[PDB]
Amino acid sequence: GKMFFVDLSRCTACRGCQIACKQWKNLPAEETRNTGSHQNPPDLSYVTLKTVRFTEKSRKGPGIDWLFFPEQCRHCVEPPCKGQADVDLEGAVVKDETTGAVLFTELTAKVDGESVRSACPYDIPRIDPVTKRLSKCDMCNDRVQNGLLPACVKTCPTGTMNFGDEQEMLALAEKRLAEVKKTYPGAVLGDPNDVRVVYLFTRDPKDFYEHAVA
Amino acid sequence: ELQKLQWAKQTTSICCYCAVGCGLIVHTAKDGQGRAVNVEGDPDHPINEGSLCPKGASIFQLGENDQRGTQPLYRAPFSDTWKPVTWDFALTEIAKRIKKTRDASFTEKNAAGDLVNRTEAIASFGSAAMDNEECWAYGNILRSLGLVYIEHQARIXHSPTVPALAESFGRGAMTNHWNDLANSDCILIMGSNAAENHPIAFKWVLRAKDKGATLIHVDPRFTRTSARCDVYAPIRSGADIPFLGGLIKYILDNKLYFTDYVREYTNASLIVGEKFSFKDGLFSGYDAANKKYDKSMWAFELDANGVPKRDPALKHPRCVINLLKKHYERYNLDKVAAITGTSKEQLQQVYKAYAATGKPDKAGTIMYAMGWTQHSVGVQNIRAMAMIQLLLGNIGVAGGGVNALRGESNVQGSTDQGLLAHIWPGYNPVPNSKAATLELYNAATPQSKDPMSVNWWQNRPKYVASYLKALYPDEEPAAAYDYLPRIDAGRKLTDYFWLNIFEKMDKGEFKGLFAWGMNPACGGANANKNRKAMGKLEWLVNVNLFENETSSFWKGPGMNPAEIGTEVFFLPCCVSIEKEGSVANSGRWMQWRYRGPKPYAETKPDGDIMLDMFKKVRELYAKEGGAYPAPIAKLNIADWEEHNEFSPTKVAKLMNGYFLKDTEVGGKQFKKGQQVPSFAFLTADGSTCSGNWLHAGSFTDAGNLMARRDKTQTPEQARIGLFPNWSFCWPVNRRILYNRASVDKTGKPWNPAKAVIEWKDGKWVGDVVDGGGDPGTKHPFIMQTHGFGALYGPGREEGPFPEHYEPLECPVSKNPFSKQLHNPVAKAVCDPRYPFIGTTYRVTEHWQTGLMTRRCAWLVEAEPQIFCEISKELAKLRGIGNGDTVKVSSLRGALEAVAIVTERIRPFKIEGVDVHMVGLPWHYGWMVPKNGGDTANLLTPSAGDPNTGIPETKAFMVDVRKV
Ligand SMILES: Nc1nc2c(c(=O)[nH]1)N[C@H]1C(S)=C(S)[C@@H](COP(=O)(O)OP(=O)(O)OC[C@H]3O[C@@H](n4cnc5c(=O)[nH]c(N)nc54)[C@H](O)[C@@H]3O)O[C@H]1N2
Ligand SMILES: Nc1nc2c(c(=O)[nH]1)N[C@H]1C(S)=C(S)[C@@H](COP(=O)(O)OP(=O)(O)OC[C@H]3O[C@@H](n4cnc5c(=O)[nH]c(N)nc54)[C@H](O)[C@@H]3O)O[C@H]1N2
Ligand code: SF4
Ligand code: SF4
Ligand code: SF4
Ligand code: SF4
Ligand SMILES: [S]
Ligand SMILES: [W+6]
């Protein structure tokens, strides 16, 4: 299988990833407004598979710790969401055995969408209020199968986004965690054994987002 | 295969936004015969390696955008509606306006009876967005027609700084390049928000940190840049010179300068004349009536041969280095800390990290962009940066340099092609009315009697003559010299510049404006004034991608179209990915890009618009005569076109240049029609043409070097990332300027592990050497008259050393460093109803006035509306909740915005009072989207600096009220 290593100690919140995901899939733009933040869209939705979350945390002396979290489906090794969906119709959620990708098919209109989202420990799935389809990050599985990096990974300028074979990535994450600790000594890997999207957080994952970790 | 890409033709392009110059791959349907289906990063491009920020990443949505213009539109005087019109109509009628305005306004000779051959009744804005061949062609068309009022973006952000670099090093340009940042040991980002404004640069900045570098952000605001630096140091607006002067005193006090470099390569050892003095904030030669200096009082003491005297022991009290120590001893830690608002501990931390790079085998770089350098002492801010870098030996080295980040993708190129009033292409001055002959124009270049001083500008007669041959190949250059317009030797140069074009417009003194690839109704300070002033034009020609606040100023807020007489032609141009040509990035990399999709609808590339337009004017002169026809009739536009269309390729070859006969030069035989291989082989006798001497070496008999996509590198090239076989940079592919300074007088690098050049077996290896010659036989700064890096800079209007003069008028009354509060060489009202310092800046997701990005749904989705950023303290004081609507007002205008209350903004402490800074983006405009807001330039003043002629967009007084 394949793994993302997401080094958030390198993120500039350029939102290249957010725009790239929509360009590759030709997704529509939400209606948004500023409600006191750079963050927009405020949330994942049917047509938004990745949003960069912004959090300001007070620190001693000048400036802040400004925490950026580009949110996507973690492509869990043992997907809760499938287990929930395989109760209404085994088929709506499958696992590509090549890539590791957890994929929502057209059959998700038949299952209880509401229920699949609640099963997700990362609150990832989103429902089309028309077609009742469940939508989320599909790992750009077409591109991966064709030996291309996912759009969000190729676009990232900082070296935050990394993709590859689960072995090389876990290797890289351990070696990167050691280096990053020298600057952010409270840095940790998010649920590195359960997921295919391993975030390096610079501190308490929960400071980046309520569902940053399970 | 991926179905989306399977049947599409793949071409390469270069991002149309910022001057990083990221590579694209464009997929086009029907094997190139239809529309774009995908745009993403070019994985092979060595600057971005496939990555794009959201601006480049959204170029598909910019290009395939059904809000784009489709055909010319016409707005009759007092009409309240566009009528769609043919290209034929638009261009023939525009050619008639130009002819009528020119025939009626042309002046052979001014008051003083001097030949000027010009029209002052037509002005042109734009553009850094056009391809280099379009910029060159555009300038030559406007000058053939007799224009002098020719300006673009560069005036606003780079013009106030370039002369700092020219004085210090001999050239105006960024000294290194993006990839080189990875080689730095300490990166000081000061007057730049590069993580948002040059986002792919942070690939190389964070790579420098991987290798051990400390990253320092010095900014009044905590930004996305700040979040990823080791050190964030807040500085109050305008306290940059105190900060940098304190760093100079720290370097000299602690003896952290690179001694051998300083002795050999800088003017540290030059003896300044006994007439040089400084006291209480005034240098010698001050004329208090005219607020102006006699700079002759700053002259060097010259030897018997006319060469500045040197004491290599550095003992003489009038040695530059000794006068330098004396000048900066006033910038102690306590004084600097108090004015900057930066803690003494944080100043010490930043000084010690950065000055550690004075070590020969360590390199420091400084990145600045626009910052707050717009004001009258911005040039002196950049002088202090240059002088610090020279003291530490960081000029000419890998990971070193002054990286003056360019803004727009081709603002480097547009400047190089002379789309500013004071320069022809290749930085040859526009003649003034006293330059009666070419011989006399050429007489003004200073000479050096120092044999070690290359003084390269002595070659200027070759460039000017080779230039006049590319415009007027059948005339003698001396004769051609008389076709091109001249400015008044009597007038202040700034009378021909951006801010005074608006001032003149508002007085009805212009009949015609070209708004070519610019949006002045949002870009100009005091938009209220400029929008009204655009009413006082007979005709406006706007060439742009979309209908906008400039094309449609006549139906903007508070305007009644009936009252407004200005006739408007809107000419829709094609996007970057729908045309071929070159753009010159910040690093001077001139990069070729190709057409992917054919032009949308009836849009045209700028080249075809401008060529066809000029052809109509020329045919009109050739039928009905009119004012001084020769410059128009004789211009060689034939070398510009191929199969009836503008040819980027042929124009680029003309820009590089070719021999008009068999010729011997540098003892080599050259056949007529051969491409000039380098500016080293141009002639002043008319043997050679070159549209731009800097471009000599760019397109040779070997072919188009700008279109090279070769990652081939020797090990010493790859160790520092030169990529010399990837495109082409001026001059002659010298990737790091001043690189002779990177080695001792035997040709051995100061830092072997990051050599730039190295003398090995009779030859310079690595970069192309910046100036030919054996080690230790030439001074390293070959464009300098004297050949040294200038610590002491006696050509600057404000004085030879940077001195703090307060650029914030309103909240400051005392200068800690002298009795002199403001720049003694430069009328803010400071009305107390406006107590807050307003400032404008950028976000990553929007571009300039937002004319392009406000049409892009994904970018509006991330940043939908104008906002106002304020501290919790100012939030507390004005009763403003996060996300509340606020009214921001000034003497000039008012607008509504969403409050962002953030700890990232802090109050300033100025003479024991809290002063609140309020932050706005200037990416918004009344045209689009719905609820976006209007330009922050409703708030800004159009009062600028008598000497820079640049407006004030970074510190202007406002009030902010909850609504
Ligand atoms: N995303 C994006 N990138 C752009 C552009 C764009 O519109 N959007 N425009 C491009 C253009 S044309 C240009 S010229 C460049 C400009 O690039 P930048 O100069 O980086 O742009 P700004 O954000 O205007 O200003 C930079 C920073 O200067 C800080 N600053 C303000 N006053 C002072 C001061 O007194 N001292 C110091 N040290 N800092 C101060 C501001 O707080 C801000 O963080 O960016 C280019 N890149
Ligand atoms: N308050 C405030 N005002 C500022 C600034 C600030 O910091 N604060 N920044 C200043 C600076 S640095 C600058 S550079 C100016 C910029 O001001 P402008 O250049 O007027 O701004 P835009 O027009 O938004 O810049 C991009 C333009 O390029 C055009 N374009 C794109 N591609 C092409 C093409 O192929 N051909 C043609 N003809 N046009 C094309 C787009 O349509 C768009 O009009 O604004 C200045 N104004
Ligand atoms: S992996 Fe693909 S689908 Fe998932 S967030 Fe990235 S670009 Fe979007
Ligand atoms: S993160 Fe949620 S939606 Fe994605 S695989 Fe896990 S359980 Fe499923
Ligand atoms: S592209 Fe990379 S640096 Fe930019 S927001 Fe996404 S993950 Fe962060
Ligand atoms: S805007 Fe600048 S950094 Fe962003 S993709 Fe374009 S060239 Fe690269
Ligand atoms: S610019
Ligand atoms: W600019």
Author numbering:
A (entry chain B): 2 to 215
B (entry chain A): 36 to 861, 869 to 1005
Give sentences from the paper.
Metal-dependent formate dehydrogenases (Fdh) catalyze the reversible conversion of CO2 to formate, with unrivalled efficiency and selectivity. Desulfovibrio vulgaris Hildenborough (Dv) Formate Dehydrogenase 1 (DvFdhAB) is a W-containing enzyme capable of interconverting CO2 and formate under mild conditions, with high specificity and turnover rates (being especially active towards CO2 reduction, when compared with other Fdhs). DvFdhAB contains a W active site coordinated by two Molybdopterin Guanine Dinucleotides (MGD), one selenocysteine (SeCys) and one terminal sulfido ligand (=S/−SH). Additionally, four [4Fe-4S] clusters are used for electron transfer.
In this study, we soaked as-isolated crystals of DvFdhAB with sodium formate and flash cooled them in liquid nitrogen at different time points. Notably, in Fdh_1min, one formate molecule is observed for the first time close to the active site, making hydrogen bonds with Nε from R441 and Oγ from T450. Formate molecules were assigned for the first time to populate the catalytic pocket of a Fdh. One of the features in the reduction of DvFdhAB is the conformational change in MGD2 with the distortion of the ribose moiety. Here, we observed this conformational change in the first two time-points structures, whereas the remaining active site residues are in the oxidized form conformation, suggesting that the conformational change in MGD2 is the first event in the reduction process. Unexpectedly, the first noticeable change upon formate incubation was the C5′ MGD2 swing. This movement seems to be independent of the metal site reduction changes. For these residues (E443 and Q890), despite small shifts, the structures until 1.5 min are comparable to the oxidized form.
